[PDB]
Design a protein around this ligand. Structure first.
Ligand SMILES: [Zn+2]
Lengths: 441, 122, 464, 97
């Protein structure tokens, strides 16, 4: 028969404490890095959590997309973890489901990430499944063909958010080069798409010096010993279409949008390599976040801002920081006016309480983004791929050491560059395109 | 059985080549191939293998079947210049069909069914 | 056949011994204040962020018909100021911590929790006790919140799954406390004031019905000192208003019934089929969790549904019978719900219903050892994924203390899960599903959903 | 002022330039001068069958002259390759100048 013991009661006296306690490591674990003979960087951090995460970061994304291979990052996101040279799609799916592990693919503006999160007891299975799924992938004709409807409906679902569209237009307008290529493309772009287009894109982005294997919650020496015969990547390092900030102004028309969106952005000079500039950009993003609901059913009310969402992006060599504010279609000029006046209000000076608030907000976001094992592995991989090393302790120390003079001088030097204006919806109250660029002066 | 089954395979290969020679002589007059002799209604794996194909291959297969059925109605064969060009053993389906059948054999050892059924009309 | 790629992995399911995970798992330390309030903490060895809050053994079940929806209005009003902090002072004090305040009101459980860093535990304790014990409950803010709630009542602004599950509770537990909705009817919202809120707080937010749980970067004894300083004014039990006595006085009742909510122009059809489940204390609730894992779930954004190890997911993904679905297992103090919810179209309603009913009834006869082993491994792995997050560990501590009266060690939960075999799954499904009444709820385009006699006949097999 | 349009599958790129015709349809002379300017901007008028006038940058040129009540809008719309849009703008400015 089954167990008849009530759940508030403890179970039977045969309940063996087979796990022995002790010992926790006496020191905080740190990221170790060691390259391979092929040139693959392996960067892992040990963690007391019982979940091991393994993420493979490949340079590419929308930046590596040609006009021939447009939209290939989204299709690679959907079509990943399918049949390989050693496993069919059925066998690979059953192997992932057997150990209770989850897989994901994620395409960024300048990278593509593949990862498998699993129990610490099944880390070799996760590593071998991820290695086979990225290295030996057979992008068959019918499996790629049968997924284009899912890709197109997901793209149409993503473009229904006006924030995603405004982000795409902002990235195109601000940049010249690979960083201006659209990531979340229109569904009509993937119409004449085949598996040879995907194979061409994958061949263009794959090289052993463009690949970072990141991990969380595993021994580094064992990981390198087991990833030695798997990541034997061969390929040619394609030239990177490097990008420079140029700014400008563009508008996108939506005839049945009940809200008009206004986007403003500035270049975060230095990119992810500069820790101090990245910390200052995070603090400016926290400062511009006027309406952040920290309590349930908060009732903040602005006179013109229906919604305000600031952002701060960090890429290899450059980035953006700014704000996207919505509003009524008849109130867009006042939305532009308030968005403009807010940054001179920030450039004039920040108080010590406001600086402490923004520093605490940015530190909270930074230490919340790495609190989980998959988030920590993703942060390690993104940092090693962008700059060659990961240390969020230096980022936190730079956030803590920021004074009001540093932020004031940063915003003053930031307002001395080119702005960027992007508007969504029906523009029946767009005042002047030239004058709003000269308001900062 | 293993002592005699080592050399029972070349005799199988010789009989198979003779069979394919005779049938391909029969098939070439209608302009057909050996893979055109497989019916999606008769086998659900062939129906699955046929939708995994690029559209031009399916258009060519339909064209060959239409030509053969027209020839069968007219009680004719292909003319000599067309008949000398016929390639009855140029496969377009055997790789895809072999993959489909291997997948079905793999699913059956784990108790899973095939993810398709027969073609049902009406 | 690659040698480096085809080692250590194979698709054949086998039992997995999860014992070496438990050595590194933290332990929980529980203390009890003199008023009955429990403080329980679990210290993660290298953590920076901490979550903490108060879990109260109260909800919309323990209301009356006159004050239904007082508990949901409490989380609308409790953040609008206190006797020591105003609105702006509370806002700047929360945003100085670099964190969030959140509240959740259920039917049998209420939570008021915060997510902070490890250096702001004491400020979070102080602000939580100040919110919970010293709130203004201003009439002007009540009048401002009532207009918003009434406008969203009259616009009919609700999630579709929430509407379906509320209808399913109201028809399954009719003439029972669990049949009420959390938000409450229009009349009670329109005629609510400060005194009902005050009386609900004084009656139900007592000592032994509340648990202070924290997880992450937190010290136990320091939190005990802060909790004794802050929550010491919480009153104790009156013997006539204990949770067990209230449960005995007004028990739950399950009636087999049908309800649908038909709309003239609706694109989607959402339906749920539920059986009478198990309570928290029922020893067969663990095989119900294994069965809920066996049925699984699916949405059309996944392209590998046809390769799933679950037969219901296989049928729905292969035949395209629904857009999304998920099996559920709800547990309560004395009863529960068990079944499948899904979103489909009007032309696929009968086929989806037959798939649900045939997959549920098959578990009373045909259970394979491989599917049981796979679902047990998936259950234990999902239990380990909750251990990765501080919020889920804190919620687990509070819920387990409130509904079991203790904190179950992970070794005991693993031993209970590991004791479930195919025979136990067959016996539990035979007890709970086979030839039993069920409750069916639907909404939207439901003209082609079958009636109760169609569902009732497909709980048993005449072929056997 | 100035604006923009985002078109996902436009094989070409279109640029419009316009000015105000003062007086609208009410003034005979200003409308006549605007019509003369519209004809002066006619670069490729199809006066013969199958004639192939080749421009360096343009793919199509289409001027106009609308005369409403009190005000008008005389101008020109020119197409071009997606990679040569700045050249289209430069050529249009050069033509008006
Ligand atoms: Zn509400």
């Amino acid at each position: 028969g089954g167990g008849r013991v009530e759940v508030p009661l403890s179970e039977k006296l045969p309940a063996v404490t087979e796990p022995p306690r002790t010992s926790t490591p006496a020191t905080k674990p740190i990221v170790q890095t060691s390259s391979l003979r092929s040139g693959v960087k392996v960067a892992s951090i040990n963690t007391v959590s019982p979940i091991s995460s393994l993420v493979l970061f490949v340079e590419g994304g929308a930046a590596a997309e040609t006009p021939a291979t447009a939209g290939a990052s989204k299709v690679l996101e959907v079509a990943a973890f399918k049949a390989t040279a050693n496993r069919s799609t059925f066998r690979l799916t059953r192997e992932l489901e057997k150990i209770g592990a989850t897989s994901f693919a994620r395409a960024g503006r300048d990278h593509v990430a593949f990862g498998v999160d699993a129990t610490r007891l099944n880390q070799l299975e996760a590593l071998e499944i991820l290695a086979d799924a990225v290295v030996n992938a057979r992008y068959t004709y019918w499996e790629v063909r049968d997924s284009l409807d899912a890709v197109k409906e997901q793209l149409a679902a993503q473009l229904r958010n006006p924030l995603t569209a405004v982000n795409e237009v902002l990235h195109r307008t601000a940049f010249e080069g690979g960083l201006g290529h659209s990531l979340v493309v229109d569904p009509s772009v993937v119409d004449g798409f085949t598996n040879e287009t995907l194979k061409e894109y994958v061949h263009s982005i794959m090289a052993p010096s463009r690949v970072v294997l990141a991990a969380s919650g595993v021994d580094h020496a064992e990981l390198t010993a087991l990833a030695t015969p798997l990541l034997n990547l061969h390929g040619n390092a394609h030239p990177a279409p490097q990008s420079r900030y140029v700014g400008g102004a563009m508008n996108i028309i939506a005839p049945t949008s009940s809200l008009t969106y206004v986007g403003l952005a500035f270049e975060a000079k230095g990119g992810a390599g500069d820790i101090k500039s990245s910390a200052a950009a995070s603090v400016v993003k926290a400062l511009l976040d006027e309406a952040r609901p920290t309590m349930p059913y908060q009732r903040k009310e602005h006179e013109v801002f229906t919604s305000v969402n600031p952002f701060a992006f960090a890429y290899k060599g450059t980035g953006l920081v700014g704000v996207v504010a919505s509003g009524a279609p008849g109130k867009a000029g006042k939305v532009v006016d308030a968005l403009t006046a807010k940054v001179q209000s920030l450039a004039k000076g920040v108080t010590d309480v406001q600086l402490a608030t923004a520093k605490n907000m940015a530190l909270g976001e930074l230490r919340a983004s790495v609190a989980t094992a998959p988030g920590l592995a993703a942060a390690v991989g993104s940092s090693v791929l962008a700059t060659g090393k990961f240390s969020a302790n230096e980022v936190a120390a730079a956030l803590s050491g920021l004074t009001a003079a540093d932020v004031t001088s940063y915003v003053n030097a930031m307002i001395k560059t080119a702005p960027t204006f992007v508007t969504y919806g029906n523009l029946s109250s767009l005042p002047r395109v030239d004058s709003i660029a000269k308001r900062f002066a | 059985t293993s002592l005699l089954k080592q050399v029972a395979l070349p005799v199988f290969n010789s009989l198979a080549t003779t069979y394919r020679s005779v049938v391909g002589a029969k098939l070439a007059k209608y302009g057909l191939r050996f893979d055109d002799l497989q019916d999606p209604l008769k086998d659900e794996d062939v129906a699955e293998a046929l939708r995994r194909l690029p559209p031009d291959v399916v258009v060519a297969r339909n064209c060959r079947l239409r030509r053969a059925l027209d020839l069968s109605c007219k009680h004719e064969a292909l003319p000599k210049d067309l008949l000398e060009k016929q390639t009855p053993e140029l496969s377009y389906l055997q790789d895809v069909l072999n993959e489909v059948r291997a997948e079905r054999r793999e699913r059956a050892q784990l108790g899973a069914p095939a993810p398709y059924t027969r073609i049902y009309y009406d | 056949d690659a040698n480096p790629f085809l080692r250590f992995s194979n698709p054949r399911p086998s039992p997995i011994d999860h014992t070496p995970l438990l050595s590194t798992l933290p332990e929980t330390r529980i203390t009890t204040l003199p008023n009955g309030l429990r403080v329980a903490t679990e210290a993660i060895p290298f953590a920076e962020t901490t979550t903490l809050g108060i879990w109260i053994n109260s909800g919309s079940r323990f209301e009356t018909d006159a004050n239904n929806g007082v508990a949901h209005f409490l989380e609308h009003i409790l953040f609008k100021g206190t006797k020591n902090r105003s609105v702006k002072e509370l806002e700047v004090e929360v945003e100085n911590m670099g964190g969030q305040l959140n509240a959740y009101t259920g039917r049998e459980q209420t939570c008021y929790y915060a997510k902070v860093m490890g250096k702001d535990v004491g400020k979070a304790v102080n602000i939580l006790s100040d919110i919970l014990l010293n709130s203004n409950l201003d009439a002007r803010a009540i009048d401002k919140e009532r207009d918003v709630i009434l406008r969203e009542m009259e616009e009919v602004n609700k999630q579709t799954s929430e509407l379906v599950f509320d209808h399913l509770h109201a028809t399954a537990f009719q003439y029972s406390p669990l049949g009420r909705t959390i938000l409450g009817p229009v009349e009670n919202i329109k005629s609510i004031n400060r005194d009902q809120l005050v009386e609900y707080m004084k009656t139900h937010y007592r000592g032994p019905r509340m648990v202070l749980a924290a997880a992450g970067a937190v010290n136990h004894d320091e939190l005990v000192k802060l909790a004794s300083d802050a929550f010491g004014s919480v009153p104790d039990e009156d013997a006539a208003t204990s949770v067990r006595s209230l449960l005995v006085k007004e028990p739950s009742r399950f009636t087999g019934s049908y309800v649908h909510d038909r709309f003239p122009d609706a694109s989607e059809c959402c339906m749920a089929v539920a059986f009478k489940g198990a309570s928290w204390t029922d020893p067969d609730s663990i095989p119900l969790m294994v069965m809920q894992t066996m049925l699984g779930g699916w949405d059309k954004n996944s392209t590998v549904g046809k390769h799933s190890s679950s037969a219901l997911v296989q049928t729905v993904a292969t035949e395209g019978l629904a857009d999304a679905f998920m099996a559920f297992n709800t547990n309560y103090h004395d009863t529960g719900l068990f079944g499948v919810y899904g979103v489909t179209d009007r032309d696929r309603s009968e086929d989806f219903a037959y798939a649900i009913m045939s997959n549920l009834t098959r578990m009373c006869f045909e259970v394979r050892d491989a599917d049981v082993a796979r679902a047990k491994n998936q259950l234990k792995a999902s239990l380990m994924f909750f251990q990765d997050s501080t919020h889920h560990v804190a919620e687990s501590i509070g819920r387990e203390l409130l509904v079991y009266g203790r904190r179950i060690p992970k070794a005991e939960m693993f031993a209970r899960i590991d004791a479930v075999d195919a025979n136990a799954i067959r016996a539990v499904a035979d007890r709970f599903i086979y030839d039993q009444d069920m409750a069916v709820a639907s909404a939207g385009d439901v003209q082609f959903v079958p009636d109760y006699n169609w569902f009732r006949r497909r709980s048993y097999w005449l072929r056997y």
